Amino acid sequence: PRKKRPEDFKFGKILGEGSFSTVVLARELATSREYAIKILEKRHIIKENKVPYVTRERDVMSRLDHPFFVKLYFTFQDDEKLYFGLSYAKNGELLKYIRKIGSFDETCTRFYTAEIVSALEYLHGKGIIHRDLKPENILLNEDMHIQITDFGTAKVLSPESKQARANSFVGTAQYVSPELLTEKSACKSSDLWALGCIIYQLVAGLPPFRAGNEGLIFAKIIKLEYDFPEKFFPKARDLVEKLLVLDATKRLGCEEMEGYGPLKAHPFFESVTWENLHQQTPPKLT
Ligand SMILES: Nc1ncnc2c1ncn2[C@@H]1O[C@H](COP(=O)(O)OP(=O)(O)OP(=O)(O)O)[C@@H](O)[C@H]1O
Ligand SMILES: O=S(=O)(Nc1nc2ccc(Cl)cc2s1)c1csc2ccccc12
């Protein structure tokens, strides 16, 4: 189609602000469709050497075609700014619901964990590592299905070299894998570590490695220093213990553990129908 331009849209509220981006709700005049438009200032990203992150985000998102990811519909630019046209995730961040509710029940924990597993299976099947999986980056659409976002720090592993490890230091402390801290590289299994953290957080309210700053958190991660609260659903506890494993080759779902089949077969997921999650009605959180 014709390249879109800013005047093709009526811009509305700011949906959120990043350190070098702003996301604005926009209605396309010719169609009445709503998009979340992520806008970046060229001078700002050139100055702060963020151009690689912007090109990474476009390149990775352009490869994705799955219901559990924010879709990139279009991009355009003017003299001052870059624009990403994204699907609008009307119900915002998963983190919001964790804070409000405190502790998901077992059915809700199972359902949302299954959608994240499904999404990661797709992503890893394409040879892509997210590297910053966290509840702030798991948005929710109008139907309360997940919409994973934030791919500027993701990595497309090279099939040509059978690349397994990536060397950029990226992520968020609470969810960073021990291999990134100690071996200075991430792999697909690093996302499975983050998954373990997120499952724990859905039930416990807070993620497992807790401290008031990053260095203290890093020290706990490499020691596997965490504990479960009382009443933590037993099969979920078992799953988390099989994800929060220091050796990245021993995490359920990783390539060396023979992939997503054994993970999806975990007893915590016994009642899950994997084939069509995005067409199932999500369980009510309250
Ligand atoms: N597709 C979307 N639909 C609805 N809201 C969105 C969408 N994408 C992002 N947002 C909201 O806008 C916020 C800002 O997103 P953006 O990617 O610009 O920065 P960030 O990732 O939050 O921050 P930083 O880049 O500093 O880590 C997000 O945290 C999220 O709340
Ligand atoms: O055209 S791209 O393929 N590459 C880029 N062009 C520019 C131009 C100026 C600046 Cl500061 C950065 C980039 S990076 C692209 C990546 S993200 C995005 C968003 C809107 C339009 C183009 C692009």
Q: Where are the domains of the chain?
A: 1-92, 93-284
8-state DSSP, 37: E
Measured from the Cβ of residue 198, the count of other Cβ atoms closer than 10 Å reads 26
Q: Is there a binding annotation on residue 103?
A: no
- In the reported structure, the alpha carbon of residue 77 is separated from the centroid of ligand 2 by a whole-number distance in angstroms of 7
- In the reported structure, the alpha carbon of residue 70 is separated from the centroid of ligand 2 by a whole-number distance in angstroms of 19
Same fold, 1-92 and 93-284: no
* CA–CA separation, 87 and 73 (whole Å): 7
- The answer to whether the beta carbons of residues 97 and 148 sit under 8 Å apart is no
Q: Which atom of ligand 1 is nearest to the CA of 93?
A: 31
* Amino acid symbol at 66: H
Lookup: tokens for 129: 């590592």
Q: Is there a binding annotation on residue 247?
A: no
132 is catalytic: yes
- The answer to whether the beta carbons of residues 242 and 251 sit under 8 Å apart is yes
Could you tell me the CA-to-CA distances from 136 to 46, 99, 231 in Å, in that order?
26, 11, 25
Spelled out in words, what is the top-level CATH class assigned to the domain 1-92? alpha beta
* CA–CA separation, 191 and 120 (whole Å): 8
Probe target for ligand 2 pocket from 62, 82, 86, 151, with the most ligand atoms within 8 Å of CB: 82
Lookup: tokens for 78: 């003017």
Lookup: tokens for 92: 């915002």
* CA–CA separation, 106 and 102 (whole Å): 13
Report residue 79: phi and psi, to 5°. -70, -25
Ligand in nearest proximity to the CA of 95: 1
- In the reported structure, the alpha carbon of residue 143 is separated from the centroid of ligand 1 by a whole-number distance in angstroms of 19
Q: Which helix (H) or strand (E) holds 260?
A: helix 260-264
Contacts of 170 (CB under 8 A, 6+ apart): 131, 132, 153, 186
* Amino acid symbol at 223: K
Q: What is the resolution of this structure in A?
A: 1.5
Contacts of 273 (CB under 8 A, 6+ apart): 280
Looking at domain 93-284, does it have CATH number 1.10.510.10?
yes
- Ligand 2 site residues (CB inside 6 A) read 42, 45-46, 51, 54-55, 58, 75-77, 82-84
Measured from the Cβ of residue 150, the count of other Cβ atoms closer than 10 Å reads 21
Q: Which atom of ligand 2 is nearest to the CA of 57?
A: 17
* Location of structure tokens 């709503």: 34
Lookup: tokens for 178: 């021990």
Write down how long the chain is: 286
70 alpha-carbon distance from chain centroid:
10
Could you tell me the CA-to-CA distances from 24 to 12, 13, 149 in Å, in that order?
6, 6, 15
- The answer to whether the beta carbons of residues 142 and 91 sit under 8 Å apart is yes
* Location of structure tokens 């009307």: 90
Identify the residue whose C-alpha is closest to ligand 1 atom 21: 18
Say how many CA atoms lie within 13 Å of 250 toward its Cβ.
8
Determination technique used? X-ray
Lookup: tokens for 233: 């659903």
Do strands 155-156 and 22-28 pair parallel, antiparallel, or not at all (unpaired)?
unpaired
Q: Is there a binding annotation on residue 20?
A: yes
